[PDB]
DNA sequence: ACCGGAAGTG
DNA sequence: ACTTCCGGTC
DNA sequence: ACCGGAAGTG
DNA sequence: ACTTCCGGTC
């Protein structure tokens, strides 16, 4: 079953979702255009009725410690997957 | 009559006030230890019944544009008078 | 907490 | 020369 | 808006 | 592997 970061990649890959979540075109950077719609869909995925962006974003922040994501500083709702050796290892072989 | 920055200097000079506002000892840096007490006293000074730190701090921020103050980044309630040529001119000859 | 736009006041 | 309000961002 | 501590859950 | 809550800071 899908971890949050994997679920986001499935959303980002499909043009059907571009109105609420999209790759920006710079490396692996992405924007949660409608972050509450991303949250609603993650909530459905996990059977979490009350999921919202506040709580979703906290898991994104935990990904900073895991080394697979970073915030794009000063860009609203914009994050990026990290392009570095530790990030690829963690994403290639998720536990 | 006293401008905000002058009134603060009068407070900072007197040891009687050290519990709510004090020079930190680094150049002209100072801390509003109890910022609402600073606000209450500024309010009395200006006959502004409802003065608070939110509104007082906005005038401090206007002083950034005037060039006589700066925030000390990341230090709670800590500001400094600027030590540079424009600041001294503005403080020596206030309009 | 902090930032700055916007509109206001003898 | 601020005051008030307030939307936006570590 | 964003940050991270703290305590929680099949 | 997050979820929930929430105090703190541009
Ligand atoms: Ca921005
Ligand atoms: Ca490593
Ligand atoms: Ca601090
Ligand atoms: Ca000059």
Author numbering:
A (entry chain A), B (entry chain A): 367 to 461
From the paper:
The Ets transcription factor family consists of 28 genes in humans containing the evolutionarily conserved 85 amino acid Ets DNA-binding domain, originally identified as a viral oncogene (E26 transformation-specific). The Ets domain is a variant helix-turn-helix (winged helix) structure, comprising three α-helices and a four-stranded antiparallel β-sheet. Here, we present the crystal structures of the Ets domains of the entire PEA3 subfamily (Etv1, Etv4, and Etv5) together with the structure of the Erg family member (Fev). Furthermore, a new Ets dimerization interface linked by a redox-sensitive disulfide bond is identified, and this dimerization is shown to result in a significant inhibition of DNA binding, potentially linking Ets transcription factors with cellular redox regulatory mechanisms.
